[PDB]
Write a protein that binds this ligand. Structure first.
Ligand SMILES: CC(=O)/C(=N\Nc1cccc(S(=O)(=O)Nc2ccccc2C(=O)O)c1)C(=O)c1ccccc1
Length: 82
């Protein structure tokens, strides 16, 4: 089950996720992801905007998320539900 979740990123500064395939390791208080509710811990992160996460190292995925969260605009996260 694959779901795409688009977040406006206007009411919250950060996603509020940790990443540990790349999985959502945790969802944190105060982030856009927790407020939205559609993504859950354990979901597998497949794509963020136009960046596919296949074969990506954890360090590179953190760098990608940092760069995307730092730029203004919506963020679309495609996950496979746990
Ligand atoms: C809720 C939340 O998000 C949190 N800290 N967030 C966060 C932390 C570091 C870098 C980025 S980041 O701007 O570089 N963006 C990311 C880069 C990599 C992976 C994930 C993110 C992300 O946004 O989740 C976002 C917190 O609990 C928090 C607690 C106290 C004070 C401030 C924040």
């Amino acid at each position: 089950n694959i779901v795409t979740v688009t977040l406006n990123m206007e009411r919250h500064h950060f996603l509020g996720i940790s990443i540990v395939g790349i999985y959502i390791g945790s969802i944190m208080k105060g982030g856009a992801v927790a407020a939205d509710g559609r993504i859950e811990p354990g979901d597998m992160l497949l794509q963020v905007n136009d960046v596919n996460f296949e074969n990506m190292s954890n360090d590179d995925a953190v760098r990608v998320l940092r760069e995307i969260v730092s730029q203004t605009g919506p963020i679309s996260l495609t996950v496979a539900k746990a």
